[PDB]
Design a protein around this ligand. Structure first.
Ligand SMILES: O=c1ccn([C@@H]2O[C@H](COP(=O)(O)O)[C@@H](O)[C@H]2O)c(=O)[nH]1
Ligand SMILES: O=c1ccn([C@@H]2O[C@H](COP(=O)(O)O)[C@@H](O)[C@H]2O)c(=O)[nH]1
Lengths: 212, 212
């Protein structure tokens, strides 16, 4: 939410991850943590970050398993302190509903990943993305993830989910997406490498904020 | 955390509560919601506030029942979306442990209320407060609540819990506590009426922040 900028913290060691996150904390209040960091440092890193930085944590786990396993993944993730989890919609409605049920039980949120931002997304996901977004609307999903790299697709996604839904978007910077154009449709942009690989992460974050 | 100021939102109707909270949101990022609002508008108000204001919510439920009931209260409260819950320590260790167990299961936090801020606290709670704080330390509690109205007691509490524990303090303003003096010992101050009954809540919040 702060500055409509979410940091994707994909460094793989705790010391560097804490250093960069602390350096840019005055610019953000929401950090997306994924498997690169969690599989290297453990799930306890989520609660550590949440406490140390007083930020919201979105666990980007691209959840994509059967219902029963998705439920277990969501339970472990919320137990670890995550405020929200990103779930793929392409595995179908039952898999998404399993995640929504756990989020309801635990007072948390599910973000539905519709279309991905990388080139390969055009092979199979893009053709199913509008229907995946419609499925989300039908299931009551209120939070979505769409691609910064294809603003016309981000626009179509926004059209399907409505103005009240919350939409975040990765692919800004390194993948080629533009901050300002992405924010014409998304509520917040996700930025990873453009900030965490910069010589001065704080200056990189400040520059993105200045550009928007 | 923001400005070390936590709003105690004890208005009893949704419209006024949303109005004041929205007016002072630029000054805070943490709202304490208690029974005055929840029993008048329902537990759904917690998730509504959390979403609408993107703030952390501490449920001040002064939990004070037997272990089994405390567990149920904590589960319902975290399911409703609260980030933390305030629990009395005077009912004993088993009652506090029940709350800690649910918070661990759900990735949330427990704040232990040691000494209360009102005059009647001197009758029974004050004499047991140092031991209640020690009990908290022994149980692994990391978040505490102490009285703004008695800074020497707040100092003694801080001494027992250590500098690493997080301490919040009500009784600022209406009850007579001073913002600056309270912050010599507490990490954050809780302020209710001095802000929510003010003719201009934003100006009242701004003034408190200016004074510190
Ligand atoms: O469609 C998607 C879904 C997720 N991410 C994730 O969002 C972040 C974008 O990082 P970056 O390209 O700004 O470094 C990474 O964690 C990446 O895994 C994408 O980039 N695209
Ligand atoms: O020892 C305690 C425990 C809790 N509260 C609560 O903190 C808030 C303080 O509000 P106010 O006196 O600033 O209006 C209220 O919600 C009140 O119930 C106290 O004041 N003192």
């Amino acid at each position: 939410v702060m500055n409509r900028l979410i940091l994707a913290m994909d460094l793989m060691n705790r010391d560097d991850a804490l250093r960069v996150t602390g350096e840019v904390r005055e610019y953000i209040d929401t950090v997306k943590i994924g498997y690169p960091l969690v599989l290297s440092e453990g799930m306890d890193i989520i609660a550590e970050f949440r406490k140390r930085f007083g930020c919201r944590i979105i666990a980007d786990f691209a959840v994509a398993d059967i219902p029963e396993t998705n439920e277990k993944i969501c339970r472990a993730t919320f137990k670890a302190g995550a405020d929200a989890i990103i779930v793929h919609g392409f595995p179908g409605a039952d898999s998404v509903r399993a995640c929504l049920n756990v989020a309801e039980e635990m007072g948390r949120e599910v973000f539905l990943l519709t279309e991905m931002s990388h080139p390969g997304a055009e092979m199979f996901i893009q053709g199913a993305a509008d229907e995946i977004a419609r499925m989300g609307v039908d299931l009551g999903v209120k939070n979505y993830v769409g691609p910064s790299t294809r603003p016309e697709r981000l626009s179509r996604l926004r059209e399907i989910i409505g103005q009240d839904s919350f939409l975040i978007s990765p692919g800004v910077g390194a993948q080629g997406g533009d901050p300002g154009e992405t924010l014409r449709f998304a509520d917040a942009i996700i930025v990873g490498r453009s900030i965490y690989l910069a010589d001065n992460p704080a200056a990189a974050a400040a520059g993105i904020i200045e550009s928007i």
